[PDB]
Symmetry: C6
Amino acid sequence: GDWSFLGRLLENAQEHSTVIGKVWLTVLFIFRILVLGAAAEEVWGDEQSDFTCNTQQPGCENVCYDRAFPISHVRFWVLQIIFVSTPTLIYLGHVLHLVRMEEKRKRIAGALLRTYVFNIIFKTLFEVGFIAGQYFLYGFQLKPLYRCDRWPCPNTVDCFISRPTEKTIFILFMLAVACVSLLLNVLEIYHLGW
Amino acid sequence: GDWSFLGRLLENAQEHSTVIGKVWLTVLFIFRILVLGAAAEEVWGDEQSDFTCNTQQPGCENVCYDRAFPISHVRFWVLQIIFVSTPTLIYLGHVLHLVRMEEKRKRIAGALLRTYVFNIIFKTLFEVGFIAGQYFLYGFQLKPLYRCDRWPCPNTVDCFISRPTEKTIFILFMLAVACVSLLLNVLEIYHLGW
Amino acid sequence: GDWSFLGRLLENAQEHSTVIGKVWLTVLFIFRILVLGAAAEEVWGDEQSDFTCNTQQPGCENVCYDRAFPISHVRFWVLQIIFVSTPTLIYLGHVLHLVRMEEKRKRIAGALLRTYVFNIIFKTLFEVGFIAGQYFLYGFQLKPLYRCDRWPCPNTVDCFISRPTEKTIFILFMLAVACVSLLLNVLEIYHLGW
Amino acid sequence: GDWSFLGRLLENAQEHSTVIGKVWLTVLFIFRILVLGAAAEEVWGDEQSDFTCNTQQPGCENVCYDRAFPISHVRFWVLQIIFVSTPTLIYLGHVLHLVRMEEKRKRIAGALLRTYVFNIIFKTLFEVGFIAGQYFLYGFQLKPLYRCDRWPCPNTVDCFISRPTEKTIFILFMLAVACVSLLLNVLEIYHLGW
Amino acid sequence: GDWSFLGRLLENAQEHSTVIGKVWLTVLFIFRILVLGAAAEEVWGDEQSDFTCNTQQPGCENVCYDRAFPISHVRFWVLQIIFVSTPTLIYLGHVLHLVRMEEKRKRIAGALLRTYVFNIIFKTLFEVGFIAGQYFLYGFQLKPLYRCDRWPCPNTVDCFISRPTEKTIFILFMLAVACVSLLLNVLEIYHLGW
Amino acid sequence: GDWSFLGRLLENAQEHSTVIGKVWLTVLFIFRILVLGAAAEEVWGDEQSDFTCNTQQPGCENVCYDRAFPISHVRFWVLQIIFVSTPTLIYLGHVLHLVRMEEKRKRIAGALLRTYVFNIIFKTLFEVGFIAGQYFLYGFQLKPLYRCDRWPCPNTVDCFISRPTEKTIFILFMLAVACVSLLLNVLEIYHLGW
Ligand SMILES: CCCCCCCCCCCCCC(=O)OC[C@H](COP(=O)([O-])OCC[N+](C)(C)C)OC(=O)CCCCCCCCCCCCC
Ligand SMILES: CCCCCCCCCCCCCC(=O)OC[C@H](COP(=O)([O-])OCC[N+](C)(C)C)OC(=O)CCCCCCCCCCCCC
Ligand SMILES: CCCCCCCCCCCCCC(=O)OC[C@H](COP(=O)([O-])OCC[N+](C)(C)C)OC(=O)CCCCCCCCCCCCC
Ligand SMILES: CCCCCCCCCCCCCC(=O)OC[C@H](COP(=O)([O-])OCC[N+](C)(C)C)OC(=O)CCCCCCCCCCCCC
Ligand SMILES: CCCCCCCCCCCCCC(=O)OC[C@H](COP(=O)([O-])OCC[N+](C)(C)C)OC(=O)CCCCCCCCCCCCC
Ligand SMILES: CCCCCCCCCCCCCC(=O)OC[C@H](COP(=O)([O-])OCC[N+](C)(C)C)OC(=O)CCCCCCCCCCCCC
């Protein structure tokens, strides 16, 4: 998609953020947004086209793909990116507001300190939450075979998924990127406190 | 699509708007435009391609998809974005006109105050209206099965929709974003009055 | 498509135009160009792919789609945009030429006044003309069923169109946008005269 | 495609050219490049996909499409644009070279006059030539039916073309644009001579 | 594809190059890169999709397309562009290095002269080489029929190619462009020597 | 995909890097990123669409493509580019941090020297590693035939790959580019030490 607006906002965040925060933003842009655009979106292009079920029942493939993949992985990662980014926008807005107020009348202390720490907190929580949701929804291994018993499918039908190994690889890659982001938030807290 | 022109106009609106207004515009750009471009448009890519009806009647799938989905959701959201944005453009134009007039001769009071409040009002009305239209047209749950009795379909035919669960998720996501926009307009009114 | 060049020219037109003219250009960019790019072009993507005729005759679907839709709607709107825009480019060029001449030697009167009024006139005429052509070619309701008797089709065949309801909606939307443009040209004339 | 580089060069040409030349370049950008990108390329998207021949012979559709359409129209127009543009680049380069030489040492006369006139000449010749080639290759009406007798086709087979009416419309549109370009070159010559 | 980076580098090369070199770069950008992007890539879009073999043997079309077209033409031209461009980048880098060194301490002679001449030489060699490779691999006429005897094909099968005439036209066009580039390099050498 | 952000970061790296480093970055941008975008991604577009297995077993093609190509080549190259780039970003960040610190108070020595050398080291290791992984996973020749015995396939089935020769060519091209990158890192080390 088009991430230019968010790109500008997060560059401005880089202008006003800790070094570890800059590392976090660079990770976000290179290892998550870029990887989705260049690589992952082409793996999931034929997710439903190349999803094959051994049946002659109309509508069984559709409902079985819907049950196998309620939300697609790529979409889930998109939402994860947006949500983990939002706190940074909040902090950047607080900063610009204080700057405008100073200008009206006539560098991390007071409200900025607290707000930044809270930003860190929320980023961490959201990240952990998406990780856990991904685990409980799919785990971290996409098996080639999916057995479906949803109406209109007669008895249990066997269905086969496109590119399970490649998808598995990218699932783990993005999970590792998320864990790196968590480590970076922890390091930022430590740096602040000491 | 290409939202760059609107992007520039709404950035200019950010230059001249309340803090809560800036939050509203950031929500608009990140949670609605971006989500449509990156995520939702790929969910609805195969809306009619993967729409399957259990019949051998030529033309039944077409008329049954037309009856099930008169306007697509993504298109409806596009129109919603445009319409909720228009008032902001009107207010921005009023502002630039007053600036040009001052320049000819030789900061929210008088006409700007009223016009801004009215902008808020219209944004709210339009938002609520689209929400209600969405509800009365589709509700907020897209069932996998759609039973169609429209000519040329013989008797009632069963038809099956692509990605009902994912579409349901995104419907609710966008509804929640709209409700957040409403809360923001209310907060802006309150801030003005007090 | 790519409207950037025209975008720049019409922004320059905004630099030199009446307030109502600025409103007209904003309408052009937001409600016509943007709507086509984001929404309408995806409705008409499968116009011929999902056009189904109940026959086993080779070539009947092609000739029946050609007879049903001689020019596609989206293409017609593209041409409408270009043509209604041209006068504005003519006026902008007259303006830049006078500016260059002043520069050589060493704000709406004389030739600029007349030329601007004529621009208005032409914009109006073209708009009305496209509206009427659209009406006489298609009307403003796209029926799902189209009965075709063109060779090689044997006797009369029934053919079915993709997304008739959505297309009908967008037809009316664009017609209303055109009528708004007409009202704006009328208002601009009135403002000039008084 | 991507016409940005050529766009920049021809904008520079506008910086150094007659008023009628500026009109010519605006015509080139709006009525030929833009129309191809936004409209014509979508008419010819399914030129071979929706080309249907009434036969069961493998390879007959391919050779019959190749014989019906040796070069596609859109490609022919692309080449026409490039070739009619080249002279303008030559003149612009002559100009920049003279400017650089003046700079080394320490507004249409001499070499610039001749070179510009010759540019006009070549533009005219190329235009007329492409027009005539288009006529002799296709004429200006694309008939729906094409009868093909090329091996491997057995006896004569009937083949049917996609969107003949729409293609016919756009053929005539582009021909009229080319004739307007010719009129503009003639007017430029007249302006120079008088 | 995206040629913007290379575009910037070669514009910088234009800043520091002979007039004939500027002509060469303009040829490169307009007649080779642009033609590929706008025109040729759409001719070769369905190279394998519309490649039809008269057989019922699974896998024969794949191996016969692979034997007929080991490397596609468009890809070959892409590589040709890259390779003929590289020397220019080398010369530009030599230039910028000398400029930086002058800056540290505190216009074609010495090392720059030799390096530029060598650039010319390499460009010529590479060009000639690609031309000859194209000839020995395909010649300059793409016949519609290709007879294939590669396993798993039983005996010899007849296979038919998409758009042979159009491809033939573009092959010759690009060959002529390459010969023009050669003439330009020769002219540049002559200009230097005299 | 979209490499603009990385492009900016690596341009900044060029601002602060050795000449051989600049050559390395130019190689990265021209011979790896550009080649993937313009050429390789179109070779691997139909990797699974045109993958044909001689069987009537549902799901055998999917599992046999997954076993033949666990990760696609293009995706592997994408990851290779990202990883070999990361060290350069680390070094650039170290540099900008030292610059900011100098600014607070009031050119390759100390920490910058070590960090740069380590960057070189890591780039080399990663490169070699990806090379070896590519070899052990696929080798450097993609055979047309792949024999598959994975469930649900009955006994051993023959499967055929799209464009094996072209893919083989590009595999070797990218391997040679990687070896050139290795030579450049070695040359940079030598230049530093002497
Ligand atoms: C503010 C934070 C709010 C958090 C709210 C959490 C709400 C949790 C509701 C718990 C209801 C559980 C009941 C249930 O769900 O019924 C079981 C059903 C799965 O059925 P199954 O066991 O057969 O396996 C499924 C196999 N299949 C994947 C092929 C289908 O559904 C599942 O378990 C899938 C559950 C997926 C949960 C996704 C949570 C996303 C959290 C995002 C947080 C973002 C923070 C900003
Ligand atoms: C300035 C504001 C003007 C507002 C004008 C509102 C006009 C309301 C006209 C009321 C006519 C009702 C009669 C009717 O419509 O016949 C019923 C028919 C649905 O048939 P059904 O009951 O079988 O279920 C349908 C199930 N199916 C979805 C699968 C097809 O159609 C429906 O109800 C669908 C109705 C959808 C209404 C959409 C309203 C959009 C408002 C946008 C506001 C924007 C403000 C800027
Ligand atoms: C400078 C201005 C010049 C204006 C020139 C106007 C020329 C008018 C020529 C009049 C000839 C009428 C004879 C005729 O056309 O035979 C009837 C035939 C339709 O047959 P049908 O009755 O069975 O229904 C058709 C149903 N079907 C749509 C499914 C096919 O064709 C039609 O009526 C369709 C006619 C469509 C007219 C489109 C006019 C566009 C104007 C654009 C103006 C732009 C200004 C800048
Ligand atoms: C520097 C200027 C050089 C100009 C060189 C002109 C060379 C002319 C060669 C004359 C040879 C004629 C013999 C011939 O060609 O055999 C006839 C054959 C058509 O067979 P057919 O009669 O059955 O109808 C064809 C029906 N079908 C279209 C469905 C296939 O081919 C045709 O006539 C098609 C001929 C198409 C000519 C295209 C000329 C393009 C000029 C571009 C100028 C650009 C200037 C910068
Ligand atoms: C630094 C410069 C290094 C240059 C190295 C040149 C190496 C030449 C190796 C010579 C081996 C010849 C043996 C051979 O190849 O066996 C014959 C076989 C073709 O079989 P066939 O006769 O049946 O016809 C083929 C018909 N079919 C196209 C449908 C398949 O293959 C062919 O001849 C096709 C040969 C294609 C050669 C392409 C050379 C590209 C040069 C690029 C230079 C770039 C400079 C920067
Ligand atoms: C920090 C560095 C960590 C490096 C960790 C290396 C871990 C190595 C694990 C070794 C396990 C070997 C067991 C195994 O794998 O079972 C054999 C199985 C292949 O079965 P097969 O023999 O039948 O042939 C396969 C033919 N087929 C391609 C059509 C499927 O799998 C294979 O061998 C394929 C193995 C592919 C290895 C890819 C390594 C990528 C390294 C990237 C380094 C990036 C540095 C930043």
